[PDB]
Amino acid sequence: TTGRIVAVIGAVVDVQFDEGLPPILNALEVQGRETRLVLEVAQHLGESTVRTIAMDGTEGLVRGQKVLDSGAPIRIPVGPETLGRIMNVIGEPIDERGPIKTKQFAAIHAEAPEFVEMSVEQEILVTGIKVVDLLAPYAKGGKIGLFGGAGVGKTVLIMELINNVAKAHGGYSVFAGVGERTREGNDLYHEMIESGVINLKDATSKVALVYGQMNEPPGARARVALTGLTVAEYFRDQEGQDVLLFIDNIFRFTQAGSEVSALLGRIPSAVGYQPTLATDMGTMQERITTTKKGSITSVQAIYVPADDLTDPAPATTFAHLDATTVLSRAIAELGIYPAVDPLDSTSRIMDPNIVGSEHYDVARGVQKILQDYKSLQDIIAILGMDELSEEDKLTVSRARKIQRFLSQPFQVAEVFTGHLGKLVPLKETIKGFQQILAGEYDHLPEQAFYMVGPIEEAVAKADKLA
Amino acid sequence: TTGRIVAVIGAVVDVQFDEGLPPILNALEVQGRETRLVLEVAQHLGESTVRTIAMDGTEGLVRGQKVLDSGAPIRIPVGPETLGRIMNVIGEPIDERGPIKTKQFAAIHAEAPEFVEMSVEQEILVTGIKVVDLLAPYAKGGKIGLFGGAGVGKTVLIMELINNVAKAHGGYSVFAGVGERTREGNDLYHEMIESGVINLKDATSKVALVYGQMNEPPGARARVALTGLTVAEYFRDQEGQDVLLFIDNIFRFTQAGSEVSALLGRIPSAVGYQPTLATDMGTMQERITTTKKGSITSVQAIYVPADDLTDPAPATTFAHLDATTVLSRAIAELGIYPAVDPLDSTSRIMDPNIVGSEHYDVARGVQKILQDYKSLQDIIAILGMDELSEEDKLTVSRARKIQRFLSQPFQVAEVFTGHLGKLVPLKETIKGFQQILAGEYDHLPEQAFYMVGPIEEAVAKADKLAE
Amino acid sequence: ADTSVDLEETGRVLSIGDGIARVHGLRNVQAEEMVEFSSGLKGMSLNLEPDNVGVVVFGNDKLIKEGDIVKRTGAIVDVPVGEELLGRVVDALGNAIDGKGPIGSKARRRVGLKAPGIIPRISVREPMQTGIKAVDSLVPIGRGQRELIIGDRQTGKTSIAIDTIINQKRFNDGTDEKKKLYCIYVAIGQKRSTVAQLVKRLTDADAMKYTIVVSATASDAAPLQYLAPYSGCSMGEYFRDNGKHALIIYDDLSKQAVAYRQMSLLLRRPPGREAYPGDVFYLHSRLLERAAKMNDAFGGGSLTALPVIETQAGDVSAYIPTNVISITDGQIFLETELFYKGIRPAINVGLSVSRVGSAAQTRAMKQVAGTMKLELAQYREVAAFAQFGSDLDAATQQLLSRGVRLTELLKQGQYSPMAIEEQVAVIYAGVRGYLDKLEPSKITKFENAFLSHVISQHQALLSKIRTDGKISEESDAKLKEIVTNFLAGFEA
């Protein structure tokens, strides 16, 4: 079918059809352009007109221009030949390595797995990161979220996890760059090549890359997540594969939505966001999941605007995760990295019947002492410690030593910590924290605990501090 | 006249009349319904189409449905045969006891008493509640308001006043439940009966009841108060009696209006409210009043959205009252019931010329010390108490004891406090506080002053606590 | 003369977008009636305008296009109801989603029915035992009562509800049909894997047998999420209107409000305070008024509701939070501060209330916890006023000594709902002062030891307290004897 462009406003192109109106979600190709311009139908305004969302800049379009119904929704190359390749929202390669020659093609809009298809196995995923492992442990096939205001550690944490987990993972990985920096895509691609997870020589690549960055028009940013998502769904269900899915940043998808929403003509909801915010997050978040057919461990970075976690975007995302790592500017500014807020991160696995009571008791032990320190802080703030009880001062000592022992050097952040990256084994974490709690190091100085791996290194640092 | 329904959107129904357009406020009845559906005309949209508010559910209505102009605003059965009964927004019995055979009928919409009809007598109305009496005395025939956020004591306080005052009152009482809990009208009805204020066998009923609860459509909620108030105005004017009016909760009248407001095509005023809030409240509040003909003693519960007393609604209502009892979740949270805020409650009779200087000097004496203590609170919080002057650590003492002596076990909250309800007489109150202020109990423990009636119980409780 | 598509019982889609169809025709539809789309997709007639009908769509509007035929159903929205649903997982319309076969429903019920009036009910008097000391002792819940569970994300709100559902086996596995409680669990805006996790645990606890689970999750259309509560309510009234007893959990009413807000804005209804419809109070009042206690004249059955609301930054004064606190018969407020501090449940004594009071409590419980609530309130205050031991007397040293010991007893783990007599035994120990000399840290351990002893050895005293339902003078004497002696041997 051939329609005609009737109106153009930014990324919202209205096209009229005479015979055969395309259903909603169908991709149309604008005619008469140097490059592909896909339009995704969004709604039937009546009068044989359809309101659509462009997938690329709309400059140059002209009213009356011809548009062709592709007959289906954006469809993209899916299969193992996407492994080691970089692709677009609309599935075209952007790594200058030729066509992605796949047997099948999948449409980016699918329904979420049914209730009966759900899984409930809960396995802990150890990452080697002290704070995460001890207090808000991730889980295989689970959904993890790293909340962070600008420049707090979301990406560095994804990188370190890619290093500590993705690197020795049997099975595939999918990295979806949504609304982030292009240089980062470039930094990663080349790094992936270097460590050999991307091999441009053989078919041994274990990573497929999808990108729709900070330079794309809203509609592209609004759909690349769906695109990375689809790639991952193929490995899960069509190959019963155990997938790893990294997304930086899923907040950008929602923001993209807010960008076009006025153009679609909608009364805004709170904070200027689109009234369809939750459902849009929902039908999308619900496909990022493990099932009986396959496993999807997904780590999603969630940018928090103005640092406000009460913002509709981040606020609505908590409910979709199994584990959350809430990063803090306040902590970061103290020099504690990763800047994880220990009393604000959680994990549905923090259950005695899953991590064992030893783990469950150290975990709750650490939080209780930090919570206690937290209430003393108001008074410590005007009057310092003098007036504090001998007992209260011991919580304070221990709390400040536990707070420091929660920090740790990442390989990925070596250039900034000035120290060699460390990976601490769970039992080493459970332990080191026990002792601290138990008063076995009340003699060491705080600084001994800052930026170290295992407790054994904290004792040493103390000697060196003399 | 006969109009047709042209549009239905929630509680708002637009009707088109071919000949004869029913005036604004007129009630129309929808034809073809198992139950009586009344539509109050709200506006003349033009083109012989009127916009109206439904007095009940709009389910099953159809475009084109017939509607007859009743020729007059909602009119209800008013008179003595309303006593002991339960009525609707539209005046229908809802107690299953048959028709209400009144001689007359009254339209719920009417003008408020003229300026030359006002009265200025000011008699204290003792309630038995320490706090109210001491600091914000109610006045017979005056307008009283109980302000409070969700769950701080508005209703229980209205409940103990019905007991300590309505029960002995020689005159009628009208209790209008506006947008509150259905469970509650059933608790009160059956309590009225078990205590004979309502008599189902004879004509000894001394209370009429009107209800438009929270399970009703905005429309019903925007009018029950009118129905309630209308019943009360009859006993005031046509009989000339001393009426007691209880409304719980008048905020619901205003929330009702804000709920249809947008469907009435209006730009919102601040906080979401409708632009006609104050005037809507004014033409109503101005009828709830004592005149030279009769006397009304209205006790209105006033909900405070988000606990914010500056919210356009609670905020707009202060001016309509002669006495105000402000309840606070911060006080309640401490276990101090009734949770009245001693520094935010006021009465127009707190005048030496009206209650006397002993009453007055005590009240103000109690308020100064609570204020004095409020100011220090945040500071001894951090800097501690050692540095304080013995002069100042005595006011911390006395204040903390007064704070308690102001609580009281209500007779309607034993299910809550696990304590027998106490009613204290005005002189037992004035005296008790006078002595605490005088230093006459600086030896007893604070706890001795918590949840007790008269000061003697605080002394006895000290011993019991003495071990 | 093909006359199947006249514009009185059928219409044609003028336009469709974001789940709202503007249907032309449908001249005889009734407000709130259900209509059908060519695609087998059902919708509901919300705006009846002069020239069009605004239809909310119960499903993906992607299958709807301009021109489609829409057919009346003649029926105002309703749903399957009755005992057939027990043990099954249904969507917001009644359809099964446990792929365990069709529901054998013989009854139907309108999702939107006004709550029974004044006359048909009777004061709440029968307890609804949660299994949680803190709750059953301080903020008692009776049948026909609405008690709200409110708190920030992850403070434990759902747990309160699960423990409650699980605690009901006691009576359901029993003989007495009046003590039985059928449960309904409505998930709204939640995630399918979480619900799947939820129904697993219920199954593992042998609780599904008496539970129905209405699920309206994160990807379900706004209108399904919106309806879900009314749907589930109606299934609970079946039991309520037939002299049976039901318990419904609305988890949570926050996500529904969002759904309502979305559905509503997309219909172009002017946004109000905080962007929600001017009638969000009404949205929840209408629903929760339906939980009720009917008099013997109407079967004496009941419906008890436990709606959940999520606060932000523990701010309970917030507009929605207070909107709902002003409808229910009390609230259970959970704080993250208390939770991290070790106080789990994180119930905030001071801020939680039960408007039913002791009328929803057995005499055994009333006897032990009659004044405890205001005691703990008064304890929290002085505990603050002496965060500097300000030359404190005895009456307050005693107050702080009880306060701490009692606080430890109200603590509780998950999935282990206690029996009423078990609660009375342990609170008893504290409230009576027998524990005023034990070390706070000991208290939890003591309660496990003590309870062990009485359950094993003394079930005669437990069965009597349980049976008489009160604490007689001899039971009270047999108890004093046990605690004091066991306590001593315990502190050897």
Swiss-Prot record, chain A:
N6-acetyllysine modification, residue list: K66, K103, K140, K201, K206, K368, K422, K427, K464
Residues where ADP binds: G151, V152, G153, K154, T155, V156
Protein name: ATP synthase F(1) complex catalytic subunit beta, mitochondrial
Gene3D superfamilies, alphabetized: 2.40.10.170, Bovine Mitochondrial F1-atpase, Atp Synthase Beta Chain, Chain D, domain 3 (1.10.1140.10), P-loop containing nucleotide triphosphate hydrolases (3.40.50.300)
A cellular component term, taken from the record's GO annotations: proton-transporting ATP synthase complex
SMART domains: AAA (SM00382)
Organism: Bos taurus
Residues where Mg(2+) 2 binds: E180
One biological process term in Gene Ontology: proton motive force-driven mitochondrial ATP synthesis
CDD domains on file: ATP-synt_F1_beta_C (cd18110), ATP-synt_F1_beta_N (cd18115), F1-ATPase_beta_CD (cd01133)
UniProt: Mg(2+) 1 binding residues: T155
Record membrane topology: Peripheral membrane protein
Function in brief: Catalytic subunit beta, of the mitochondrial membrane ATP synthase complex (F(1)F(0) ATP synthase or Complex V) that produces ATP from ADP in the presence of a proton gradient across the membrane which is generated by electron transport complexes of the respiratory chain. ATP synthase complex consist of a soluble F(1) head domain - the catalytic core - and a membrane F(1) domain - the membrane proton channel. These two domains are linked by a central stalk rotating inside the F(1) region and a stationary peripheral stalk.
Reactions the enzyme catalyzes: ATP + H2O + 4 H(+)(in) = ADP + phosphate + 5 H(+)(out)
NCBIfam families in alphabetical order: atpD (TIGR01039)
Residue(s) carrying N6-succinyllysine: K66, K103, K201, K206, K464
Phosphothreonine modified-residue sites: T254
From Swiss-Prot, chain B:
Gene3D superfamilies: 2.40.10.170, Bovine Mitochondrial F1-atpase, Atp Synthase Beta Chain, Chain D, domain 3, P-loop containing nucleotide triphosphate hydrolases
GO molecular function, one term: proton-transporting ATP synthase activity, rotational mechanism
Binding site for Mg(2+) 1: T155
EC number: 7.1.2.2
Residues found modified as N6-succinyllysine: K66, K103, K201, K206, K464
Catalysed conversion reaction: ATP + H2O + 4 H(+)(in) = ADP + phosphate + 5 H(+)(out)
Binding site for ATP: G151, G153, K154, T155, V156, R181
Main location: mitochondrion
Residues with PTM N6-acetyllysine: K66, K103, K140, K201, K206, K368, K422, K427, K464
Coiled coil regions, renumbered to chain: none
Gene Ontology terms describing biological process: proton motive force-driven ATP synthesis; proton motive force-driven mitochondrial ATP synthesis
Residues carrying sugar: S48
UniProt record similarity statement: Belongs to the ATPase alpha/beta chains family.
PANTHER family registered for this protein in UniProt: ATP SYNTHASE (PTHR15184), ATP SYNTHASE SUBUNIT BETA, MITOCHONDRIAL (PTHR15184:SF71)
Protein name listed in UniProt: ATP synthase F(1) complex catalytic subunit beta, mitochondrial
Lineage of producing organism: Eukaryota, Metazoa, Chordata, Craniata, Vertebrata
Encoding gene (name): ATP5F1B
Swiss-Prot record, chain C:
Modification Phosphothreonine occurs at: T73
Role: Subunit alpha, of the mitochondrial membrane ATP synthase complex (F(1)F(0) ATP synthase or Complex V) that produces ATP from ADP in the presence of a proton gradient across the membrane which is generated by electron transport complexes of the respiratory chain. ATP synthase complex consist of a soluble F(1) head domain - the catalytic core - and a membrane F(1) domain - the membrane proton channel. These two domains are linked by a central stalk rotating inside the F(1) region and a stationary peripheral stalk.
InterPro entries: ATP_synth_asu-like_sf, ATP_synth_asu_C, ATP_synth_asu_C_sf, ATP_synth_F1_a_nt-bd_dom, ATP_synth_F1_asu, ATPase_a/bsu_AS, ATPase_F1/V1/A1_a/bsu_N, ATPase_F1/V1/A1_a/bsu_N_sf
Binding site for Mg(2+): T158, D251
Principal location class: mitochondrion
PTM comment, free text: Acetylated on lysine residues. BLOC1S1 is required for acetylation.
Example of a GO cellular component annotation carried by this entry: mitochondrial inner membrane
Keyword terms of this UniProt record: Acetylation, ATP synthesis, ATP-binding, Cell membrane, CF(1), Glycoprotein, Hydrogen ion transport, Ion transport, Magnesium, Membrane, Metal-binding, Methylation, Mitochondrion, Mitochondrion inner membrane, Nucleotide-binding, Phosphoprotein, Pyrrolidone carboxylic acid, Transit peptide, Transport
Pfam family, one: ATP-synt_ab
Sequence positions bearing N6-succinyllysine: K100, K106, K169, K178, K200, K244, K366, K437, K445, K470, K478
Family: Belongs to the ATPase alpha/beta chains family.
Residues modified to N6-acetyllysine: 62, 65, 71, 100, 106, 169, 178-179, 200, 244, 366, 373, 437, 445, 470, 478, 480
Residue intervals passing through the bilayer: none
Gene Ontology MF term list: ADP binding; ATP binding; proton-transporting ATP synthase activity, rotational mechanism
Annotated binding of ATP, by residue: Q154, G156, K157, T158, S159, Q412, Q414
Name used for this protein in its record: ATP synthase F(1) complex subunit alpha, mitochondrial
Residues bearing PTM Phosphoserine: S4, S15, S45, S105, S123
Residues of the site described as Required for activity: S352
